[PDB]
Amino acid sequence: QDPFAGDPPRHPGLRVNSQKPFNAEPPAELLAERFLTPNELFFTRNHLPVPAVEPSSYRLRVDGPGGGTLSLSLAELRSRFPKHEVTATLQSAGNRRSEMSRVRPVKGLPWDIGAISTARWGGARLRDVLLHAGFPEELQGEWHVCFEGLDADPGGAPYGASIPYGRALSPAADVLLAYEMNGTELPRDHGFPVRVVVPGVVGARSVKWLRRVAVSPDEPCVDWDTPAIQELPVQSAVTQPRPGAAVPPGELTVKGYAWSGGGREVVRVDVSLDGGRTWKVARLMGDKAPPGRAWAWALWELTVPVEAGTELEIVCKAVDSSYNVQPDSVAPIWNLRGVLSTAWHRVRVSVQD
Amino acid sequence: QDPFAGDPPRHPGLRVNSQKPFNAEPPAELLAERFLTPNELFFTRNHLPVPAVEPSSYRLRVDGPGGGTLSLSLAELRSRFPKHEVTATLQSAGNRRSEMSRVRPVKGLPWDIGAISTARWGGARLRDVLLHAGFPEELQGEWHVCFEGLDADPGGAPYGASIPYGRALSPAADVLLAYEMNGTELPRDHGFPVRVVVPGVVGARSVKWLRRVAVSPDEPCVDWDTPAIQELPVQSAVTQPRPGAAVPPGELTVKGYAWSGGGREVVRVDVSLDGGRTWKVARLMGDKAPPGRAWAWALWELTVPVEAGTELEIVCKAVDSSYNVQPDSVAPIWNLRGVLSTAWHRVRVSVQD
Ligand SMILES: Nc1nc2c(c(=O)[nH]1)N[C@H]1C(S)=C(S)[C@@H](COP(=O)(O)O)O[C@H]1N2
Ligand SMILES: Nc1nc2c(c(=O)[nH]1)N[C@H]1C(S)=C(S)[C@@H](COP(=O)(O)O)O[C@H]1N2
Ligand code: MOM
Ligand code: MOM
Secondary structure (H helix, E strand, C coil): CCCCCCCCCCCCCCEEEECCCCEEECCHHHHCCCCCCCCCCCCEECCCCCCCCCCCCCCEEEECCCCCCEEECHHHHHHCCCEEEEEEEEECCCCCHHHHHHHCCECCCCCCCCCEEEEEEEEEEHHHHHHHCCCCCCCCCCEEEEEEEEEECCCECEEEEEEEHHHHHCCCCCCEEEEEECCEECCHHHCCCCEEECCCECHHHCCCCEEEEEEEECCCCCCCCCCCCCECCCEEEEEECCCCCEECCEEEEEEEEEECCCCCCEEEEEEECECCCCCEECEEECCCCCCCCCCCCEEEEEEEEECCCCEEEEEEEEEECCCCCCCCCCHHHCCCCCCCCCCCEEEEEEECC | CCCCCCCCCCCCCCEEEECCCCEEECCHHHHCCCCCCCCCCCCEECCCCCCCCCCCCCCEEEECCCCCCEEECHHHHHHCCCEEEEEEEEECCCCCHHHHHHHCCECCCCCCCCCEEEEEEEEEEHHHHHHHCCCCCCCCCCEEEEEEEEEECCCECEEEEEEEHHHHHCCCCCCEEEEEECCEECCHHHCCCCEEECCCECHHHCCCCEEEEEEEECCCCCCCCCCCCCECCCEEEEEECCCCCEECCEEEEEEEEEECCCCCCEEEEEEECECCCCCEECEEECCCCCCCCCCCCEEEEEEEEECCCCEEEEEEEEEECCCCCCCCCCHHHCCCCCCCCCCCEEEEEEECC
16 A cells, blocks of 8 residues: 555664655764765655665666667676766755745755765766767767656656766766665665766756666657756855854864865865854865866865854855855745755854853 | 644545545546535545644635735634535546556556546635725736645645636636535545635646635745646546446447536537447536536436447547537647646447357
8 A cells, every 4th residue: 555665774863854755864963974975874865666676687778769779787787887986976956945945935845954965886887888889979969868767657757867968978977877886786765776876967867776778869758857957056064063052162163065066176165153254264175086077075174263152153155166156145046946055054053151 | 754644534445546645536437426526536636634724723814915914714704705606526637647648658646537526615705705805806917816725845835826816806707715515514635624616727726725815916825836727628538338348238328527617518428439430419417507607517428229249439529618629639639747638538348249
């Protein structure tokens, strides 16, 4: 009777926004504690019940107008294409939706600051699979690559998303058919046995439980948005301390994350303790990625003296390697879907006497 | 842990398309057996958990630019406005979606032919409530009336829908704030204590568990579609016999329903037994409504001789009082959302030897 009966167990203490389907984020106090988010804490966004996949009979279908159909086993995907490792942060379009909900009610799961997580993904390059199928580096005209999941709507339509053909074929874009996550088998909640990972691009495009790759001209495989969000803008949030905390006087360590879409590196994080009147530069920690390939977040921290009996409004904002900035307030960027919530994050705390 | 824990019990033997949220239709064999669908069989379409409403503290808010705020109790809605009774058929936008799914996979609950049901609704006229609030018969410019339900998205947004101001204020449009269904209290699944009923218009606009009525100019209250389907076209379906049935030779009684949007009366139902090559006119049964106020379906039947050992393809189509017709096939009207499935219904049966 329960369509979600076969869903996997999860780590206790996740912040669960929806049980069926399962949508949850790590608690903020753990989010910035490790550069790579442990698989058990990695935020989970499921539209549907989690597919149960027998690994030996699993086949990935690859097709398209000038290709020729492949039916690839998991063994074949592991052995016939060189394995690549890409460290990439996935962020939901609705990350920080609850801050937008606070201004005016929205539609969608009220994610806090934790609909974002980072892993080292291992797999075959989509580029290598598509070239093997007979697709060329370049096609005359505008084309896309569509991905279908094994999870399907009751009406029949599988979860699907697409990316431009140029991104799918680019050596530098690092698009993976990932079968490995942080050194181990892809967990069920994260797309076992195979997912697409599209670095620098909204999480929605990294299709889990992959069943079909299809090449198609721009104008069947359907992207669920039926323009559509691809790259995301600059994002940052304070994960320590937490809203409403009472902190002891003396030194305070403020920590958080920052990230930008499209492989743009975070080059600076500014932190304020007085609601954005004065700023100090945070120390950044990251993987120092190649130019235009900064797929992973920067974790940041700043240790600052705080005075007994005062009130703090901690604010952070980031700048990327193309010198993009964040908007300063939520109200002007508000939208009914509560997506693209990237205004300066503000956290109010009191300093104890 | 379960957001649907407080949902009401339902009649067993409904065709359940979704348990949580609850979406179900009566079985086809019972659908056309009564002109008024029993409350327990009336199709149910819920987006969310069913609100639990204590009736004495319930208040309906009525507001808008040139109105002045009302807070109406259930007692007040029953006593201060003349009660009207309107027999109206509600039909889901996705009625007969499964036939569209068969052509090509769609998104949405795969309703069969039963996402349609008819009741005699009792309540206050929306027109009378709005006039009482100080709204005039006519407003200069384009305006709408928005309805919000007590059921809200996790992001905060209540279920909502709107109708043009002209329809809300028209004496002939029969828009009701209904507190009565087929002579009894509105059941929980059908909007207890108060729902809007918008006759002649897609079911989505008849907002259940009503909390707010708001008048607003065309360009806050949000219609969930964020043009939007209002009136529906001609519809018909065969409910007896059922697909795949083996019927005895001799006489066969074919039965079904027909309906058209906007208060347009069904004036004819044609029935074929040979896939649409030859047709006979069915006998119609209905409430013989006033011109332009045919809110309720027509039930139809035809008794025809059938020959032992033959194969039948039973088809029906209807014509309304404005001489609108149904399209003949699903493929040309197919759409990803699987709505407006109104092609000629075809049912294959075998005649026994
Ligand atoms: N097949 C499938 N792929 C999917 C989804 C889904 O529901 N089904 N959710 C998408 C969305 S909206 C997001 S944000 C990411 C989340 O990936 P994660 O659950 O591994 O964090 O998966 C994407 N890929
Ligand atoms: N508040 C509220 N009203 C609502 C809905 C809902 O989910 N919430 N569903 C709508 C839709 S899409 C339909 S088809 C009808 C169905 O009404 P019924 O469940 O009484 O048949 O209710 C409409 N009114
Ligand atoms: O819905 Mo996804 O981009 O979290
Ligand atoms: O979704 Mo409604 O018009 O059944």
